[PDB]
C-alpha cells in the first residue's frame, strides 16, 4: 500500500508569524484532507477554519501533494478564521 521508508515533514507557520510547527509522517501521495487533521490537532483549529497558502496559491483540499508537487520542508502560511458567529449545527 503506502510505501516510503522515510517520511516527509513541513513547516506550518501562521500567516501572522507567531508560532511554527513541524508536521511529520507525510507522504508524497498523501491527500491534503489528511494534512489539515494535523494542524487541527496541534493548533486545535478546525480543518475549515484554518487556511493553508503556498507560493501565493490558496492550497486546495481533496488532492494529494503530488498533484500540487509540494517539496520537502516547504513553508506554508496558515491563516485561521475567528469565531465568525455562534453558527453551529
Q: Name the DSSP letter for residue 63.
A: S
Q: Name the DSSP letter for residue 12.
A: E
User: C-alpha cell of 64?
Assistant: 494529494
Do the beta carbons of residue 32 and residue 48 sit within 8 Å? no
CATH value at residue 13: 3.10.20.90
Give residue 46's domain range.
Answer: 1-89
The method recorded for this entry reads NMR
What's the CA gap between 60 and 70, in Å, rounded?
A: 12
Q: Kindly report the backbone phi and psi dihedral angles of residue 68, in degrees, each rounded to the nearest multiple of 5, phi listed first.
A: -80, -15
Q: Which of 26, 25, 24, 16 is nearest to 51 (CA)?
A: 16
Q: Which of 57, 36, 38 is nearest to 47 (CA)?
A: 36
Number of domains observed in the structure of the chain: 1
Do the beta carbons of residue 31 and residue 66 sit within 8 Å? no
Do the beta carbons of residue 56 and residue 25 sit within 8 Å? no
Amino acid at each position: 500500500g503506502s510505501s516510503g521508508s522515510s517520511g516527509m515533514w513541513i513547516q506550518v507557520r501562521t500567516i501572522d508569524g507567531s508560532k511554527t510547527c513541524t508536521i511529520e509522517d507525510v507522504s508524497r501521495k498523501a491527500t491534503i484532507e489528511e494534512l489539515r487533521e494535523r494542524v487541527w490537532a496541534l493548533f486545535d483549529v478546525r480543518p475549515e477554519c484554518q487556511r493553508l497558502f503556498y507560493r501565493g496559491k490558496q492550497l486546495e483540499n481533496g488532492y494529494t501533494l503530488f498533484d500540487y508537487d509540494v517539496g520537502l520542508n516547504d513553508i506554508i502560511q496558515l491563516l485561521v478564521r475567528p469565531d465568525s458567529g455562534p453558527s453551529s449545527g
